[PDB]
Write an enzyme that holds these catalytic residues in place. Sequence first.
Site, PDB file in Angstrom:
ATOM      1  CG  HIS A   9      -0.151  -0.096   2.528  1.00 48.04           C
ATOM      2  ND1 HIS A   9       0.470   1.001   3.078  1.00 48.04           N
ATOM      3  CD2 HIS A   9       0.099  -1.128   3.363  1.00 48.04           C
ATOM      4  CE1 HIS A   9       1.059   0.652   4.209  1.00 48.04           C
ATOM      5  NE2 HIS A   9       0.835  -0.634   4.417  1.00 48.04           N
ATOM      6  CG  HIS A 149      -0.835  -4.373   5.380  1.00 47.98           C
ATOM      7  ND1 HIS A 149      -1.063  -3.052   5.712  1.00 47.98           N
ATOM      8  CD2 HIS A 149      -2.057  -4.913   5.165  1.00 47.98           C
ATOM      9  CE1 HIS A 149      -2.355  -2.794   5.649  1.00 47.98           C
ATOM     10  NE2 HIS A 149      -2.980  -3.905   5.309  1.00 47.98           N
TER      11      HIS A 149
END
Lengths: 203, 203
Positions: A9, A149
Amino acid sequence: MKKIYLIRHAQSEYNEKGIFQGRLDSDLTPLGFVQSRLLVKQFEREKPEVIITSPQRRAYKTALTLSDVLGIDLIVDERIREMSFGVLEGRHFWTMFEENKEMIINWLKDPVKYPLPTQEDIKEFEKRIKEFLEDLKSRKEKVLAVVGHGGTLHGLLCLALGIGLEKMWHIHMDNTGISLLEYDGERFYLKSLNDTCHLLVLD
Amino acid sequence: MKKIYLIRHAQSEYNEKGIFQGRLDSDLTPLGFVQSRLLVKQFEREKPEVIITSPQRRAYKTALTLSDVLGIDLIVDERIREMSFGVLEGRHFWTMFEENKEMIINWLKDPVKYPLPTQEDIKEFEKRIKEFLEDLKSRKEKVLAVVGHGGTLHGLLCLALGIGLEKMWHIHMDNTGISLLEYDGERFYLKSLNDTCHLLVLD
């Protein structure tokens, strides 16, 4: 074969501040939104057929920029939410390293044998990302993007290549860094790690 | 930190034609020459203090372009010359796969357990690569670039990360693809694999 683009991200407020985040859920920074828009460039010619994202806001809003600008179905999957760090969430990471140099160094060298205090159970973590990966193998799309992540995307790579989560902090991904994993029906091939070509214009 | 940029050589004639090469020695194509020239863009902020190359022509010529434009020494090291593939050198790869699907699939899955016929002994190969890597740790330069071949660069990566030469065909590098390995005096961290951002202009 199947192309799986793993995408970390974009920059979140806690990333910018150097704070261990985990289950905490800070917003993208103004830079994070910029990085997300630039990420679109990497996919205009070969569009993914699905984007799968962590529900955490830093991941969802990165995925949404792609989904919306390119017109691509977005799926949320809780199994790729970041690893929980328990009582260490919200702490400045380098302050924590100065006070616990050996704990952090051991954890980076092998987080399976040296988990952090109160972190998510490493076997439970492995189970949820392994199931996600098994589901990816079965999906019908030829080209997919996964917005996730650090912990979950490094873990996925380690499992796909069969090198074990012991190695998950031997590799790095920057914000909106892309890593292409290909799957031929039987095994995986890592074609790239941490491509940030789309951010060169910010240099 | 030491920054070790691994760089696969530019495109050679045998690469362009899909021919197994190994110890054979084809020259760069016109595309390989532009790729070698574009590589310099990557070393605009961080300049290597030395370039180390395989002696084979496709590697040496790639490295010489970089060393000439950056104005830094080029050293030649026999130990990162490509793995020998014996009698299979010079065979059209895809033709060889169709006629020997199981030999090739097994070799790609685990080349230690399933070596190709007449290929370089894997323990001798490992020995020269490991000795090269040990010398890398001791070098005084803070930033350097290693121009090599698929087999030797994948193998260096596998040893640095401790994942074993069984995984050497689980990762890929394109021609002039760059992979940044960092060394902190104790262990390695892979920051990127197969970065070809300098070739974006050609797309």
